[PDB]
Design a protein around this nucleic acid. Sequence first.
RNA 1: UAAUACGUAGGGUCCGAGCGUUGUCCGGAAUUACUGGGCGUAAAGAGCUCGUAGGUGGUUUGUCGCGUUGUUCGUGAAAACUCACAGCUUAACUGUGGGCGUGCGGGCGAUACGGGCAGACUAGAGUACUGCAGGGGAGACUGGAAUUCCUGGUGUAGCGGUGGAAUGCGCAGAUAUCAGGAGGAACACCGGUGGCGAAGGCGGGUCUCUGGGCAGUAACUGACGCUGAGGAGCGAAAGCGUGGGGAGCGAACAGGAUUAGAUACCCUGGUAGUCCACGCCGUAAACGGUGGGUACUAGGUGUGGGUUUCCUUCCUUGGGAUCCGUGCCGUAGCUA
RNA 2: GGUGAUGGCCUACCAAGGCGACGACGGGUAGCCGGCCUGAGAGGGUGACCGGCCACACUGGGACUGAGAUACGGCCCAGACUCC
Lengths: 131, 88, 61
Amino acid sequence: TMTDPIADFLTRLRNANSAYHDEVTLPHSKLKANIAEILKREGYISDYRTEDARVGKSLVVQLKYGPSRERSIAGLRRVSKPGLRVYAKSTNLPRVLGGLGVAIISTSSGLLTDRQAARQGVGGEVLAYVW
Amino acid sequence: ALTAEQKKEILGQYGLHDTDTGSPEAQVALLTKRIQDLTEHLKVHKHDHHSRRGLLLLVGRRRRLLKYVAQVDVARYRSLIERLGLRR
Amino acid sequence: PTIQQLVRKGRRDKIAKVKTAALKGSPQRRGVCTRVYTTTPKKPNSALRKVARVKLTSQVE
RNA sequence: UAAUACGUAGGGUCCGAGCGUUGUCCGGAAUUACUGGGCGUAAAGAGCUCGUAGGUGGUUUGUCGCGUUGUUCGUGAAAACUCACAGCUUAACUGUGGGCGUGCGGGCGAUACGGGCAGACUAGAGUACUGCAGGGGAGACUGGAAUUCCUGGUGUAGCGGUGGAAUGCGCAGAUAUCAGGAGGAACACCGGUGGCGAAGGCGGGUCUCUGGGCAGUAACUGACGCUGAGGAGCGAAAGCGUGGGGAGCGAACAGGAUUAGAUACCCUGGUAGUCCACGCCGUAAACGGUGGGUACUAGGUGUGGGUUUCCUUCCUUGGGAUCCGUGCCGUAGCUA
RNA sequence: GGUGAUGGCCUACCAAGGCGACGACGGGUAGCCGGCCUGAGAGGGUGACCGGCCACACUGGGACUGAGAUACGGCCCAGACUCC
Ligand SMILES: [Mg+2]
Ligand SMILES: [Mg+2]
Ligand SMILES: [Mg+2]
Ligand SMILES: [Mg+2]
Ligand SMILES: [Mg+2]
Ligand SMILES: [Mg+2]
Ligand SMILES: [Mg+2]
Ligand SMILES: [Mg+2]
Ligand SMILES: [Mg+2]
Ligand SMILES: [Mg+2]
Ligand SMILES: [Mg+2]
Ligand SMILES: [Mg+2]
Ligand SMILES: [Mg+2]
Ligand SMILES: [Mg+2]
Ligand SMILES: [Mg+2]
Ligand SMILES: [Mg+2]
Ligand SMILES: [Mg+2]
Ligand SMILES: [Mg+2]
Ligand SMILES: [Mg+2]
Ligand SMILES: [Mg+2]
Ligand SMILES: [Mg+2]
Ligand SMILES: [Mg+2]
Ligand SMILES: [Mg+2]
Ligand SMILES: [Mg+2]
Ligand SMILES: [Mg+2]
Ligand SMILES: [Mg+2]
Ligand SMILES: [Mg+2]
Ligand SMILES: [Mg+2]
Ligand SMILES: [Mg+2]
Ligand SMILES: [Mg+2]
Ligand SMILES: [Mg+2]
Ligand SMILES: [Mg+2]
Ligand SMILES: [Mg+2]
Ligand SMILES: [Mg+2]
Ligand SMILES: [Mg+2]
Ligand SMILES: [Mg+2]
Ligand SMILES: [Mg+2]
Ligand SMILES: [Mg+2]
Ligand SMILES: [Mg+2]
Ligand SMILES: [Mg+2]
Ligand SMILES: [Mg+2]
Ligand SMILES: [Mg+2]
Ligand SMILES: [Mg+2]
Ligand SMILES: [Mg+2]
Ligand SMILES: [Mg+2]
Ligand SMILES: [Mg+2]
Ligand SMILES: [Mg+2]
Ligand SMILES: [Mg+2]
Ligand SMILES: [Mg+2]
Ligand SMILES: [Mg+2]
Ligand SMILES: [Mg+2]
Ligand SMILES: [Mg+2]
Ligand SMILES: [Mg+2]
Ligand SMILES: [Mg+2]
Ligand SMILES: [Mg+2]
Ligand SMILES: [Mg+2]
Ligand SMILES: [Mg+2]
Ligand SMILES: [Mg+2]
Ligand SMILES: [Mg+2]
Ligand SMILES: [Mg+2]
Ligand SMILES: [Mg+2]
Ligand SMILES: [Mg+2]
Ligand SMILES: [Mg+2]
């Protein structure tokens, strides 16, 4: 049972990075689209896209790798999952790699990066710790 | 099992129209007729645990479909229950 | 252990293997000697030590 | 018997107006693993299923925002901790008002995700159209070879047995061997690292009723999904009840033998059971020592199942593609 | 009917229910808390003093006084203890 689309998408991304893929195909969703917004604007995924398939709209992810073959994303771990969900206050926003990482936070405006949320003073739910 | 002639007949007089087959009502009708015939047979053949497993599987399927129907629309659910004689 | 199991059962901490049962949590007990004798330690170390059997205020032998 | 570990000495070490012992409690103890554990064998996946409650959800179209954060004033006693200042000659102490005070209240303004509410769609799931292979399951029917036994011939001194021998059965005619008859259990070859079954496990055929799994058309329902505490059903063999059956095999039990000793290994036999019918009991190293389900991730070598399509002889493990199950070896990773 | 104040606080009659596996009722433990010790932390332990509340006054009960009684050195009764 696909009981966590976000987790499955992140697992697919990290697995594709490990297997040295170029394109990852997933069913398309609004949450997937906006999360791709976040990651692409941060510069972790070279570029996304949404297409049309036999049944439902999907998406393909284009990654990058460091100039010396370097992996673009090192580790991917979900934080707030079905059952165990995690939130944060305006002051206790999570710190990843001492700021070297990006944590996806759901705030009133939408999903914004950790720095955006910290500067805006807004908070919400942290989605994934990307490094 | 139910063969072509009466399976078509049951689809015909129990479906919304004469084309649809995958309706929950068609599902329940087929399941009920099969279970009645099969319980008639099992009252003769006693220790066929292998097929009473399918018994329980079909019963679970019936109950799951009935839960779905009662959750979605109660009027049709109760009408079907009454017109087929099921206790629940 | 899944979160629902944790909620269902609660996490139990170790039950302390309390030593020195005689003082029952006291740093001291006073007693009266009943006998004086000697005993032989286990196989690795052999000797003739002096041990005393004492009656305690907590009535433990 | 020649101690840096006992005691004495010196010398040295830590500490100090206190120094040790003991005892309670936290820590390292991530040694109850939320942060932040593991389950193959080191301790652990139950024996396997359906499935109630609970826990959880495959999509987008829509509002209320009760899960949520959003800010404003509005509570949070003093005392204690943290910052700074202030003085007791510095000294503990307090002279000092700020600052601290991790939770709770309503009013003002948000909707991204996270529930219920709401109508619609289908990539899960499910049925529907036609095919498929199969030791799947239950009842009944039936054939064969063989053991054993009864009867009857031919037929002669042994037959059988183990490392050897006697218990054993024979001169009342053994063994063998041939005719006939009886009857119970089980089906070699097919038959394999193969089928199916959720799991135990299941195969000589025939018929009867019937379950499960898979392929193409994708017609239809449309968030029905997943798994499951308790509960309940299934569940090898051994064992028990009742009544049948009881060839072979064979615990226990007798004898023969080896052995110092054999209440065993071996031999002669041989009762439970082994089979039928219905009830029971529910444990196995019930193992793949790995719970179930979904998604993703280089290959190589085979089986079986079903599909298509082309060299096209269109014969053909000729070639391509597809999906299901099934053996072994292997990268990256993981792992003691 | 009763209370300074609603209410099974007490009484009568009606109905059979209420509490229960998001742990009732049962058993052992023990004053709660701001706090004290520990730990980077979450957390664990714990309730010295001070302080905010609670309950107790030889053991069991009850009531008077009033704005105010669990009435510690206020009252009555019963048991124990000591004494005249
Ligand atoms: Mg969605
Ligand atoms: Mg987690
Ligand atoms: Mg069939
Ligand atoms: Mg010496
Ligand atoms: Mg010494
Ligand atoms: Mg010294
Ligand atoms: Mg300690
Ligand atoms: Mg652990
Ligand atoms: Mg082990
Ligand atoms: Mg286990
Ligand atoms: Mg068991
Ligand atoms: Mg608001
Ligand atoms: Mg406010
Ligand atoms: Mg306030
Ligand atoms: Mg103050
Ligand atoms: Mg401090
Ligand atoms: Mg000063
Ligand atoms: Mg201050
Ligand atoms: Mg704290
Ligand atoms: Mg729901
Ligand atoms: Mg439509
Ligand atoms: Mg479907
Ligand atoms: Mg077949
Ligand atoms: Mg049967
Ligand atoms: Mg004869
Ligand atoms: Mg013969
Ligand atoms: Mg359609
Ligand atoms: Mg379940
Ligand atoms: Mg359920
Ligand atoms: Mg259970
Ligand atoms: Mg349960
Ligand atoms: Mg049962
Ligand atoms: Mg039962
Ligand atoms: Mg058996
Ligand atoms: Mg048996
Ligand atoms: Mg017996
Ligand atoms: Mg029996
Ligand atoms: Mg019998
Ligand atoms: Mg017989
Ligand atoms: Mg024997
Ligand atoms: Mg013997
Ligand atoms: Mg025998
Ligand atoms: Mg067991
Ligand atoms: Mg087995
Ligand atoms: Mg299992
Ligand atoms: Mg799984
Ligand atoms: Mg390999
Ligand atoms: Mg590697
Ligand atoms: Mg009134
Ligand atoms: Mg009342
Ligand atoms: Mg009344
Ligand atoms: Mg108390
Ligand atoms: Mg505190
Ligand atoms: Mg800590
Ligand atoms: Mg802690
Ligand atoms: Mg406390
Ligand atoms: Mg005070
Ligand atoms: Mg106090
Ligand atoms: Mg008060
Ligand atoms: Mg009292
Ligand atoms: Mg009083
Ligand atoms: Mg007093
Ligand atoms: Mg007095």
